[PDB]
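pasting input
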Amino acid sequence: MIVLFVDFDYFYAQVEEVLNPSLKGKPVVVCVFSGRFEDSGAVATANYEARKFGVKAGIPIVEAKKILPNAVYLPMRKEVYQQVSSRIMNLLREYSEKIEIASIDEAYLDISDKVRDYREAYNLGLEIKNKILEKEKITVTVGISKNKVFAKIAADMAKPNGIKVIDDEEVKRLIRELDIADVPGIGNITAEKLKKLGINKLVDTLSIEFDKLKGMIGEAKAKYLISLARDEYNEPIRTRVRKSIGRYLTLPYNTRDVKVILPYLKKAINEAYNKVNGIPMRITVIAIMEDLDILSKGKKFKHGISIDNAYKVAEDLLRELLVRDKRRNVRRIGVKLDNII
DNA sequence: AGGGGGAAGCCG
DNA sequence: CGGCTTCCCCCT
Ligand SMILES: [Ca+2]
Ligand SMILES: [Ca+2]
């Protein structure tokens, strides 16, 4: 199996630069403004000119502005980014049908029965890059390896505007030298738990008894990590099915008054419904509380949920959450549409 | 043994 | 911080 992973470089910011070539070479900070205060909210994506100063995704906007007070701060334009992305994805479909659209800016291609050699793979990666740059004016990073995980590692190593192959031998070396924290799917929580016990590299997870590993990080990731370190990850390209579409709004203040909350919830459902190209069979209401804790209550039907009962159902789920948590106020309210068609 | 449902984790 | 995905209870 030969897998080619495509990772659109600093996507949102880069789309902004394409829409405005006068931004290129300037710190660009694409943010999610929350509307509560001016400058409230978080950074969503920043270009390299910004991230070289610590201004990156996840940090509060006011921190960003503290570090880089003269950068170009732009609000999320997700509909645009998504149009561009759908075009690049369609573009990618010409090179393979076995394709997994992992997210808005990431996609996996099984080019196995379509190259037969890693040279062809590299060259095809250059072809893909040149095509994408030519048609959509954005640079991507291509990773190529023996599976999805190492393709992604390759991309991670070559960002931005890179191309990288990880042959079998380099896989062998990587199992031994690559930090657990750099393993795709492994975040800071898992990495910290493992780090506490001297588990630092992939091969390290072999040194510890399975039951103990599972006891630390859960069966799933334990099986995952181990299979990687044994170089037995054989997982195939699964075509899409990412059936979650969400929408979240921050309330004008914290409150338990459904009379205040429900309105914002409906608009959320509204904007959620037109973002999706199909019908959800399951709806979940999601409340972010005042202590930032999150409550979910959802319902699935054997049929599609029209927007008009999405309102009713979601109001029921909301009231239900307000019974479930009699203590805290709500700070943000949202919805997740699942099981789409 | 199995499929929800809801909380925990990842990562831009 | 925000929005998705993963995962692991939990109750037949
Ligand atoms: Ca990415
Ligand atoms: Ca990682």
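fyi DSSP finds 13 helices and twelve strands in chain A.
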